[PDB]
Amino acid sequence: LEQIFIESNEHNSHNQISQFRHAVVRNKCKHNPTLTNLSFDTPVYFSIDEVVTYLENMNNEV
Amino acid sequence: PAVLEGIFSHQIKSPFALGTLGISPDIKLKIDGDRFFSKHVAVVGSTGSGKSCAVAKILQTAVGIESKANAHKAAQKNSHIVIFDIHAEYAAAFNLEAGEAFTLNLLGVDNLRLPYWLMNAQELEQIFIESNEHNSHNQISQFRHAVVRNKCKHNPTLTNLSFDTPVYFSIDEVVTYLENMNNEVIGKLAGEGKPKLANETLVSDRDELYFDAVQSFIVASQAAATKASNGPFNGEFDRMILRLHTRLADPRLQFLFYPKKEDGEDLATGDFADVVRQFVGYMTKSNVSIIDLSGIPFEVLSIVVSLISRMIFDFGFHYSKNRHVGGAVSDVPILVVCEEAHNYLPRSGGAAYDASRKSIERIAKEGRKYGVTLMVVSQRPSEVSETIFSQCSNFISLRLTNAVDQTYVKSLLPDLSAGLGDLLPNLAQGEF
Amino acid sequence: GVTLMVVSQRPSEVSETIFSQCSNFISLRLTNAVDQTYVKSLLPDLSAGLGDLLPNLAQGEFLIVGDAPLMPTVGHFALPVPEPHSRSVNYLQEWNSGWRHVDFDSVIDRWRG
Amino acid sequence: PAVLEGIFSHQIKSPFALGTLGISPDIKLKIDGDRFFSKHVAVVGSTGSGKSCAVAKILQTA
Amino acid sequence: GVTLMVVSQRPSEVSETIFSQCSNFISLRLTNAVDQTYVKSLLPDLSAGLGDLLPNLAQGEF
Ligand SMILES: Nc1ncnc2c1ncn2[C@@H]1O[C@H](COP(=O)(O)OP(=O)(O)OP(O)(O)=S)[C@@H](O)[C@H]1O
Ligand SMILES: Nc1ncnc2c1ncn2[C@@H]1O[C@H](COP(=O)(O)OP(=O)(O)OP(O)(O)=S)[C@@H](O)[C@H]1O
Numbered sequence A: 001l002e003q004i005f006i007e008s009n010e011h012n013s014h015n016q017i018s019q020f021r022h023a024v025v026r027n028k029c030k031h032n033p034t035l036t037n038l039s040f041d042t043p044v045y046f047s048i049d050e051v052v053t054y055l056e057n058m059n060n061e062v
Numbered sequence B: 001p002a003v004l005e006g007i008f009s010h011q012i013k014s015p016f017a018l019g020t021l022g023i024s025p026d027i028k029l030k031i032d033g034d035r036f037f038s039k040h041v042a043v044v045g046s047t048g049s050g051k052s053c054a055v056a057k058i059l060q061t062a063v064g065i066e067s068k069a070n071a072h073k074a075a076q077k078n079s080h081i082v083i084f085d086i087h088a089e090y091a092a093a094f095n096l097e098a099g100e101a102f103t104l105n106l107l108g109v110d111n112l113r114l115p116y117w118l119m120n121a122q123e124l125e126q127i128f129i130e131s132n133e134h135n136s137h138n139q140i141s142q143f144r145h146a147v148v149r150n151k152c153k154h155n156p157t158l159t160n161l162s163f164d165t166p167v168y169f170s171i172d173e174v175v176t177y178l179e180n181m182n183n184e185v186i187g188k189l190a191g192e193g194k195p196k197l198a199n200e201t202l203v204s205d206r207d208e209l210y211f212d213a214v215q216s217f218i219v220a221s222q223a224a225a226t227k228a229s230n231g232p233f234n235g236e237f238d239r240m241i242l243r244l245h246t247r248l249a250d251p252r253l254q255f256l257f258y259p260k261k262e263d264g265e266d267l268a269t270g271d272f273a274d275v276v277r278q279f280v281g282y283m284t285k286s287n288v289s290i291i292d293l294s295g296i297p298f299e300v301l302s303i304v305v306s307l308i309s310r311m312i313f314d315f316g317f318h319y320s321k322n323r324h325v326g327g328a329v330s331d332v333p334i335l336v337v338c339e340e341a342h343n344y345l346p347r348s349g350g351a352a353y354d355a356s357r358k359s360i361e362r363i364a365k366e367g368r369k370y371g372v373t374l375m376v377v378s379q380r381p382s383e384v385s386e387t388i389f390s391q392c393s394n395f396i397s398l399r400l401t402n403a404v405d406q407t408y409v410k411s412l413l414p415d416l417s418a419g420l421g422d423l424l425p426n427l428a429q430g431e432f
Numbered sequence C: 001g002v003t004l005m006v007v008s009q010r011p012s013e014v015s016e017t018i019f020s021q022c023s024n025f026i027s028l029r030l031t032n033a034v035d036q037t038y039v040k041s042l043l044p045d046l047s048a049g050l051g052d053l054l055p056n057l058a059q060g061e062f063l064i065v066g067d068a069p070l071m072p073t074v075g076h077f078a079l080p081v082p083e084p085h086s087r088s089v090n091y092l093q094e095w096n097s098g099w100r101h102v103d104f105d106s107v108i109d110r111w112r113g
Numbered sequence D: 001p002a003v004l005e006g007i008f009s010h011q012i013k014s015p016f017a018l019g020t021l022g023i024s025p026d027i028k029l030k031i032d033g034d035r036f037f038s039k040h041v042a043v044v045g046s047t048g049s050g051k052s053c054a055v056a057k058i059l060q061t062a
Numbered sequence E: 001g002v003t004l005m006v007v008s009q010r011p012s013e014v015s016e017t018i019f020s021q022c023s024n025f026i027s028l029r030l031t032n033a034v035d036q037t038y039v040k041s042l043l044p045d046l047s048a049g050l051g052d053l054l055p056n057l058a059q060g061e062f
C-alpha cells in the first residue's frame, strides 16, 4: 500500500505517510466496528475515497 | 577399526561426538570441542539437505539429551544457548516427558518483556524521531534534555545520569512536557523574567510542573501594563506531538511501549536484573532459551534482535572482566544460534536493517575474549554479510548446487586434499 | 624519526593509503578469498606456492614478505612470557561443571557506571 | 646448521632474531632490523592467529 | 630539445601513455610477476631466449 499510492523521494514524505497510516487505521473501524485490536495490516474492508476526503479536509482547516 | 577409533579417542582431548564416517558406517567421529565452540561455527546448506536437523543433533549431544533419556537428571550441568527461530521449528526438538525433569524456557511476542528504557541512543533516535534523517537539530536536543532531566526525578538516588544510561523514564510525561513548552508565554515584567500561568503564579524550575499535567498559559501582548512576550520555541513543535501520539498508540508494539508485570504493573529501576535472567535462562534454570519472531512485524524485528544481542554482550563483557580482575577465565559461556540469517543480515541492504548488522558484527570481531560465540545457518552464503563469514573458523558444508557459492568452501580446502570439492552436487540427504 | 606499525583483523577494513606505503607484511592465518588475493599478489613468482598454505596455518605461524629478509619464509613464534590477557574461554570444560551463581548486584552496579 | 646461519646473517650488519624456521625448528631466524623498524611494518590476521602475542614478543625482544 | 629519463621500481603502477613513446630500455633484476608481463610486452626486440634471464640476473647485470 505504501508503494502503489505514495512517493518517497520528496522533502515532506514522512509527514504524509505518517498520517495516511492513521487515516486507514481509523477508516477501518467505522465500517468494521464489532472487532477490536485492528491494525494497519489486518484485512478488513475500507474505502479509499473517504481517505482522500479526509486528507483533503486536513489541508484547508483553520 | 579399533585403532582408527583409539586414534580419535586418545589423541584429542575434550571430544564431541558428531556421527558416522562415510567410508565405514560403524565407526564414530569426534572433534575438539574446546575449539569448535570457542571459534565461530557456520553451516551452509541448500534446500532439503537438512541443516536444522543437524543443528538439533549437535545441540542435543551438547546438552546430553540422548535416546529420549536425560542422563543428567539428578544433577544439572552448564550449557547456555539462545536460538533465534523464525518459524517455531526448534521448539519441539527439546520437549521431553516430565520424568526427564527438563526445564525449558519458551518465549514469544505475548510474553516477552523488553522495555524501552534499555535502548541506547541511536535506537531511540531511530524509533521516535523520524524526520529529514539528519535535519532536526533543535527537536533532537530538546528531546534529549527532556529525557535527561526526567530520569533524575524518578530515580533520584543515582548520580551523574546521562542520556544513554539505562534507567526508567516515562514517555507520556515527556510528550506533555513538550506540549506545554509549545504554548508558553513569558510574563515580561520587572523582575518577572520567567513563565506565567493562568493564575499569574510564575515558575522557577520548569522541571517541577510541566512533567505532571498540562497547564493553561496566559495571553501575550505588548501593552505596558500586562506585557507578555511569546516563548522561544513556540510553534516549532506543533506537529511532533501529533506524530508521536500515533506511534505510541499502536497495538502491535504494545509490548515495548507499555510493559506490564505478572501482577499488572509497570517495572521499576530495580527490576532490571530479572529482565536479563530470562534471556540467559537463569530464571527458570533452563539451559536453553528459544525465541520466536514470527508474530513480530518486519519494521521492529531489526531492533528487537539488536537489543537482545546487546544485552547478552554487555552481561558477558562485564562479568568476564570482573572475573579477569582475579585472573580466572569466564565460566558462563553462551552460544547464539542465528537461523534464517538471510532475512535480517543482507549483504547489500538499506539502513532499514543496519541496526542489526552492527550488533552481531561486534560478536564476530571481539566476542571470543569475553565469552560469546555464534552459529549461523544460511541457505546462500553470498547473501550473508562478508565480515561475519570472513572470521568463522569451522565450516559444515551440506549439499550445494551452484558454482558461485562453492568457492567459499572449495577455497578453505588445500591443494593435496582437493578433489572433494567436486562431491558437493551429489551429496545425499544428511551428509556433510 | 617517527614510524608506524598497525595491526588489523582484515586489510580491506583499513585506509588504502597507509597499507600502500607499508613495506614489509607479516601474514598470519586468513580464510576469505578476497583477503587472500592481496597477500598472494605481493609475493614473487619464483616462490609463490607458499600462499597455498595460508588457509590452514597453525596457531602461531607467520609468512613474511618485504625487503628485510633474504627471501620470503615461514616461521613459528614461541609464546611471550608474560602474556597479555587475551585467553580464550574453554567452552566444553566449563559446560561440564555445576550451575554457577552470579551476584547480579555486582554486574549491574558496574554496568551502572 | 652453522654454515646456514652464517650465510643468512653475517652479511647483514645489525640483526634481529625472530623465531624458528618451520622447515627446521633447530635454526634461528634473523632479519635486517634496520630496514625493519625503520620502514613501516604491518600485521594482518584472523581471530586466533596470534597477532597481539607476536607484537608483544617483538617489542619485548626490541 | 627536451628529453626524459624515467626510473621506477614498479612500472605497472606508472601510466601506460609514457612508457609507450620510450624507445631505449635498460632492465635489471625483476621479481614480481605482473611487471614482468608488461615489460615483456613493451620491450620491442626481446627474443624469448633473453627474457627468461630477467629474474635470475646477478648483482649489477643489465
Ligand atoms: N540421518 C537421517 N536419517 C533419516 N532422515 C534424514 C536424515 N537426515 C535428514 N533426513 C531427512 O531430511 C529431511 C530434513 O529436512 P529439513 O531438516 O527440514 O531441511 P532444513 O535444513 O530444515 O531446510 P531449511 O528449509 O533451510 S530449515 C527430513 O525429511 C528427514 O527425514
Ligand atoms: N606459540 C604459540 N603456541 C601455542 N599457542 C599460542 C602461541 N601463540 C599464541 N597462542 C595462543 O593464541 C591465543 C591468543 O591469540 P591472540 O594473539 O590473542 O589473538 P588476537 O590476535 O588477539 O585476536 P584478537 O582477539 O582480534 S586481539 C592464546 O590463547 C594462546 O594460547
Ligand SMILES: [Mg+2]
Residues within 6 Å of the ligand: B052, B089, B339
Ligand atoms: Mg530450519
Ligand SMILES: [Mg+2]
Residues within 6 Å of the ligand: C086, D051, D052
Ligand atoms: Mg589484540
